[PDB]
């Protein structure tokens, strides 16, 4: 077994420091480099950073001088120390293992996402709530068209990812199902993960990239995030199903990726 246990307290106070600790039962830390990803309560996936194979901490342009990765390779622990805590950082915090172990050439990217530690960085608030009728918000920047859609079992539907800056060919498509961590579906635009047949076709070049969901089975009702790796390192908007006979609430929680 290879088990990535990212540790967090449930509730933490703004202003101070949060040490998110990935205790890994399986691999030694220099082999399959750990990547850190936050998904907040009504916002979407931001990539925070990666400490790579020899020892380099690479980071997000907005979350840059807040983040300090130390690591104990004898105890199996990666320590993301998040300094100067802000009131909107309530979220499920992920640690993700690499597919390549030490060797870089033609980079395959990511396999084992840990379970997501739900840490409320907010002293009385969080995101959206109330009392029975109270809960609803989702606002993110990177243009995936159509993100809100209405497709049934059998129907072919194409998700067109237009990037905010130019990508060349460098995009991994990540399928998040209801109750799941984001699963790697197709890497480098059009190269499928060893395991999945020729059915989800991610096709394009430069800025606009087309994921055709061809034979739509019940497993295909999911959120398909574009991880662009050329200018920045951002996961984009994804996909959601709009329920017409329900409480349709959209509180404007602004995520800039």
């Amino acid at each position: 077994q290879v088990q990535l246990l990212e540790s967090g307290p449930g509730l933490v106070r703004p202003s101070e420091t949060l040490s998110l600790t990935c205790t890994v039962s399986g691999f030694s830390l220099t082999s399959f480099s750990v990547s850190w990803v936050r998904h907040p309560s009504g916002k979407g996936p931001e990539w925070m950073g990666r400490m790579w194979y020899d020892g380099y901490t690479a980071y997000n342009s907005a979350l840059k001088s807040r983040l300090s990765i130390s690591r104990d390779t004898s105890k199996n622990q990666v320590f993301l120390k998040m300094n100067s805590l802000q009131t909107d950082d309530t979220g499920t915090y992920y640690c993700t293992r690499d597919l390549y172990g030490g060797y870089p050439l033609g980079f395959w990217y990511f396999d084992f996402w840990g379970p997501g530690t739900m840490v409320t960085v907010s002293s009385g608030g969080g995101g959206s709530g109330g009392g029975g009728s109270g809960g609803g918000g989702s606002d993110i920047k990177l243009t995936q068209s159509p993100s809100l859609l209405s497709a049934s079992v059998g129907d072919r539907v194409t998700l067109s990812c237009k990037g905010s800056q130019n990508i060349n060919n460098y995009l991994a498509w990540y399928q998040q199902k209801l109750g799941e961590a984001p699963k790697l579906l197709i890497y480098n635009t059009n190269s499928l993960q060893t395991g999945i047949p020729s059915r989800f076709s991610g096709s394009g070049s430069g800025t606009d990239y087309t994921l055709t969901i061809s034979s739509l089975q019940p497993e295909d009702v999911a959120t398909y995030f574009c991880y662009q790796y050329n200018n920045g390192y951002t996961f984009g908007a994804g996909t959601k199903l709009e329920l017409k006979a329900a409480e349709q609430k959209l509180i404007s929680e602004e995520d800039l990726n």
Binding site: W52, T57, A58, Y59, P104, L105, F107, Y170
Partner: peptide, 10 residues
């Protein structure tokens, strides 16, 4: 962004 996230791609 950095040599680190840029591993073996371009």
């Amino acid at each position: 962004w950095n040599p680190g996230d840029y591993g073996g791609i371009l």
